[PDB]
Design an enzyme around this catalytic site. Structure first.
Site, PDB file in Angstrom:
ATOM      1  N   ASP A 112       2.528  -4.045  -9.690  1.00 57.23           N
ATOM      2  CA  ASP A 112       2.369  -5.602 -10.052  1.00 57.23           C
ATOM      3  C   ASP A 112       2.938  -5.623 -11.536  1.00 57.23           C
ATOM      4  O   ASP A 112       3.684  -6.641 -12.010  1.00 57.23           O
ATOM      5  CB  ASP A 112       0.806  -6.125 -10.086  1.00 57.23           C
ATOM      6  CG  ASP A 112       0.467  -5.950  -8.518  1.00 57.23           C
ATOM      7  OD1 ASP A 112       1.195  -5.808  -7.845  1.00 57.23           O
ATOM      8  OD2 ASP A 112      -0.627  -6.444  -8.422  1.00 57.23           O
ATOM      9  N   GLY A 152      -4.066 -13.653  -5.412  1.00 51.25           N
ATOM     10  CA  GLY A 152      -3.169 -12.590  -4.734  1.00 51.25           C
ATOM     11  C   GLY A 152      -1.768 -12.633  -5.085  1.00 51.25           C
ATOM     12  O   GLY A 152      -0.804 -11.981  -4.556  1.00 51.25           O
ATOM     13  N   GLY A 176      -6.818 -14.842  -9.290  1.00 52.76           N
ATOM     14  CA  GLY A 176      -7.177 -13.872  -8.219  1.00 52.76           C
ATOM     15  C   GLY A 176      -6.493 -14.345  -6.730  1.00 52.76           C
ATOM     16  O   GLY A 176      -7.433 -14.125  -5.856  1.00 52.76           O
ATOM     17  N   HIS A 227       0.920  -1.230  -0.084  1.00 52.76           N
ATOM     18  CA  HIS A 227       0.088   0.006   0.003  1.00 52.76           C
ATOM     19  C   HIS A 227       1.103   1.169  -0.110  1.00 52.76           C
ATOM     20  O   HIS A 227       0.335   2.326   0.303  1.00 52.76           O
ATOM     21  CB  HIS A 227      -1.124  -0.101   1.097  1.00 52.76           C
ATOM     22  CG  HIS A 227      -2.118  -1.252   0.732  1.00 52.76           C
ATOM     23  ND1 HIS A 227      -3.205  -0.909  -0.113  1.00 52.76           N
ATOM     24  CD2 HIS A 227      -2.172  -2.269   1.306  1.00 52.76           C
ATOM     25  CE1 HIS A 227      -3.768  -1.930  -0.220  1.00 52.76           C
ATOM     26  NE2 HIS A 227      -3.356  -3.150   0.861  1.00 52.76           N
TER      27      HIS A 227
HETATM   28  O1  LIG Z   1     -12.582 -11.942 -10.547  1.00 50.99           O
HETATM   29  C1  LIG Z   1     -11.594 -11.737  -9.969  1.00 50.99           C
HETATM   30  C2  LIG Z   1     -11.249 -10.470  -9.050  1.00 50.99           C
HETATM   31  C3  LIG Z   1      -9.919  -9.783  -9.002  1.00 50.99           C
HETATM   32  C4  LIG Z   1      -8.915 -11.132  -9.357  1.00 50.99           C
HETATM   33  C5  LIG Z   1      -9.088 -11.363 -10.694  1.00 50.99           C
HETATM   34  C6  LIG Z   1     -10.131 -12.451 -10.618  1.00 50.99           C
HETATM   35  C7  LIG Z   1     -10.564 -13.412 -12.116  1.00 50.99           C
HETATM   36  C8  LIG Z   1     -11.368 -12.533 -13.084  1.00 50.99           C
HETATM   37  C9  LIG Z   1     -11.402 -13.635 -14.173  1.00 50.99           C
HETATM   38  C10 LIG Z   1     -11.614 -15.036 -14.161  1.00 50.99           C
HETATM   39  C11 LIG Z   1     -11.526 -15.639 -12.644  1.00 50.99           C
HETATM   40  C12 LIG Z   1     -10.722 -14.621 -11.529  1.00 50.99           C
HETATM   41  N1  LIG Z   1      -9.088 -13.523 -13.022  1.00 50.99           N
HETATM   42  C13 LIG Z   1      -8.077 -12.424 -12.603  1.00 50.99           C
HETATM   43  N2  LIG Z   1      -6.608 -12.775 -13.282  1.00 50.99           N
HETATM   44  C14 LIG Z   1      -6.728 -13.725 -14.401  1.00 50.99           C
HETATM   45  N3  LIG Z   1      -5.329 -14.009 -14.890  1.00 50.99           N
HETATM   46  C15 LIG Z   1      -5.184 -14.696 -15.848  1.00 50.99           C
HETATM   47  C16 LIG Z   1      -4.512 -15.757 -16.665  1.00 50.99           C
HETATM   48  C17 LIG Z   1      -5.138 -16.445 -17.632  1.00 50.99           C
HETATM   49  C18 LIG Z   1      -6.332 -16.702 -17.784  1.00 50.99           C
HETATM   50  C19 LIG Z   1      -7.275 -15.980 -16.997  1.00 50.99           C
HETATM   51  C20 LIG Z   1      -6.745 -15.165 -15.735  1.00 50.99           C
HETATM   52  O2  LIG Z   1      -7.546 -14.264 -14.982  1.00 50.99           O
HETATM   53  N4  LIG Z   1      -7.836 -12.206 -11.418  1.00 50.99           N
HETATM   54  O1  LIG Z   2       0.697  -3.013  -1.734  1.00 49.17           O
HETATM   55  C1  LIG Z   2      -0.656  -3.080  -2.126  1.00 49.17           C
HETATM   56  C2  LIG Z   2      -0.729  -3.652  -3.675  1.00 49.17           C
HETATM   57  O2  LIG Z   2      -1.996  -4.156  -3.855  1.00 49.17           O
HETATM   58  C3  LIG Z   2      -1.833  -4.733  -5.133  1.00 49.17           C
HETATM   59  O3  LIG Z   2      -2.635  -5.772  -4.922  1.00 49.17           O
HETATM   60  C4  LIG Z   2      -2.022  -3.823  -6.089  1.00 49.17           C
HETATM   61  O4  LIG Z   2      -2.302  -4.567  -7.330  1.00 49.17           O
HETATM   62  C5  LIG Z   2      -0.745  -2.900  -6.181  1.00 49.17           C
HETATM   63  O5  LIG Z   2      -0.711  -2.140  -7.301  1.00 49.17           O
HETATM   64  C6  LIG Z   2      -0.580  -2.364  -4.632  1.00 49.17           C
HETATM   65  O6  LIG Z   2      -1.492  -1.588  -4.440  1.00 49.17           O
END
Ligand SMILES: O=C1CCCC2=C1C1(CCCCC1)N=C(Nc1nc3ccccc3o1)N2
Ligand SMILES: OC[C@H]1O[C@@H](O)[C@H](O)[C@@H](O)[C@H]1O
Ligand SMILES: COc1ccc(Cl)cc1C(=O)NCC(C)C
EC number: 2.7.1.6
Length: 392
Positions: A186, A138, A136, A44
């Site tokens: 990121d 993290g 997703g 952050h």
């Molecule tokens: O819903 C969220 C909320 C926030 C985080 C975010 C997710 C989702 C959204 C789309 C599908 C499931 C999860 N995916 C992304 N990343 C992502 N990276 C990828 C690489 C290859 C293929 C697919 C990919 O989806 N992260």
């Molecule tokens: O350190 C907190 C971090 O939160 C991440 O998840 C976001 O993608 C970064 O841009 C940074 O704000």
């Protein structure tokens, strides 16, 4: 209580290649890889023009593809965590009409990067997308897809810009097509990572330093909570506004310009929580410089301790931890040979990062699993390369 297999570029490539042949009836011409991230310390701080010390993971997004002459984009993804459909087609955006975010969600990442790609003329293309980055979870799956996407458009139509400008495009895509107003970290680490190095990023100057991060006595243990509270999405922009208000209330361009003395003096000009958010940011920027210094001179114990101070700050002042991460941290810190642990990434779920004697990783995993009220996932990463290209 075992470290998940991390497939290498070559095996994810073969997988994407086999998939591409089946779907399009011809070998792909191009291949790109971009990794996910763990943040060692400096949470952050990035949107606060602060310091961040991320490293690229062995977990990555590969994308193999071929230019088209018809101006349309044809995508398949093999990541069965992805939302339906696995396949999407759409025309290139035009002066007349632009790509818009929608269903399926995973494609918004590709659409965003293509919409804001600054070099013409961008042709259409056919592409398969595969990822080891848990979606997703993290470790910046989205940034890995955005940067891989960017790297691929570069083969289609070279930009002439900086590494930071490319990160800023990927970040614009995240903001406008995923509705997550992230800072630069990121995307920057996914572009700029190097095997064996952490990347110190000055999110004010945009100066970066590859910092040797190579002592085979030490390890970095990533633990996935396999949890994501709704607040990870809703409260992220709230922290940004709180930080922005405290900077307005102090006449500061950013909280980077503010030390704890200045912040204590102005206790009366901000909220109880405002002051707490700022206290964390200020202290986290200090702790990232300190951690950088500690790493150079090989002081793993100081580094681990700064990791534990970052977590406490994040849990009590920034209030972006959650019970699961708190539990994984106290667990990790109870294991002989662990120097430090903290939540990494946005918070409200996702992973913790732990620095520990390599010989201890096995015991750490047994003990964290046993003490975790749910089911934890394990990776052991060294530092890995950023975005790469292989002509096919
Ligand atoms: O819903 C969220 C909320 C926030 C985080 C975010 C997710 C989702 C959204 C789309 C599908 C499931 C999860 N995916 C992304 N990343 C992502 N990276 C990828 C690489 C290859 C293929 C697919 C990919 O989806 N992260
Ligand atoms: O350190 C907190 C971090 O939160 C991440 O998840 C976001 O993608 C970064 O841009 C940074 O704000
Ligand atoms: C996060 O890593 C470190 C933090 C501090 C110090 Cl003094 C050394 C290392 C290191 O060399 N890790 C080896 C590899 C597992 C990254």
């Amino acid at each position: 209580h075992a470290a998940l297999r991390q497939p290498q570029v070559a095996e994810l490539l073969a997988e994407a290649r086999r998939a591409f042949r089946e779907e399009f009836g011809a070998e792909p011409e191009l291949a790109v890889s971009a990794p996910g991230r763990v943040n060692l310390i400096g949470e952050h701080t990035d949107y606060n023009q602060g310091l961040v010390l991320p490293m690229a993971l062995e977990l990555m997004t590969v994308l193999v593809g071929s230019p088209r002459k018809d101006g349309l984009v044809s995508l398949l993804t093999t990541s069965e965590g992805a939302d339906e459909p696995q396949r999407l087609q759409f025309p290139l955006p035009t002066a007349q009409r632009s790509l818009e975010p929608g269903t399926p969600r995973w494609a918004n990442y590709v659409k965003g990067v293509i919409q804001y790609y600054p070099a013409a003329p961008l042709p259409g293309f056919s592409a398969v997308v595969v990822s080891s980055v848990p979606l997703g979870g993290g470790l910046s799956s989205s940034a890995s897809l955005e940067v891989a996407t960017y790297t691929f458009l570069q083969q289609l139509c070279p930009d002439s810009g900086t590494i930071a400008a490319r990160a800023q495009v990927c970040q614009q895509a995240e903001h406008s097509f995923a509705g997550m107003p992230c800072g630069i970290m990121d995307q920057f680490i996914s572009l700029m990572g190097q095997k064996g190095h952490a990347l110190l990023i000055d999110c004010r100057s945009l100066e970066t330093s590859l910092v040797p991060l190579s002592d085979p006595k030490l390890a970095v243990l990533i633990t996935n909570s396999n949890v994501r509270h709704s607040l990870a999405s809703s409260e992220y922009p709230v922290r940004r506004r709180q930080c922005e208000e405290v900077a307005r209330a102090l006449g500061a361009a950013s909280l980077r310009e503010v030390q704890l003395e200045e912040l204590e003096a102005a206790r009366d000009l901000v909220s109880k929580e405002g002051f707490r958010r700022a206290r964390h940011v200020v202290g986290e920027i200090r702790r990232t410089a300190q951690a950088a210094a500690a790493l150079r001179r090989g002081d793993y114990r100081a580094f681990g301790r700064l990791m534990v101070e970052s977590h406490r700050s994040l849990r009590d002042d920034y209030e972006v931890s959650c019970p699961e991460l708190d539990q994984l941290v106290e667990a990790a810190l109870a294991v002989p040979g662990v120097y430090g642990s903290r939540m990494t990434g946005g918070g409200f779920g996702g992973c913790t990062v732990t620095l520990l004697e390599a010989s201890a990783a096995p015991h750490a995993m047994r003990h964290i699993q046993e003490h975790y009220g749910g089911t934890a996932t394990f990776y052991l990463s060294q530092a890995a390369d950023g975005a790469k290209v292989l002509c096919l």
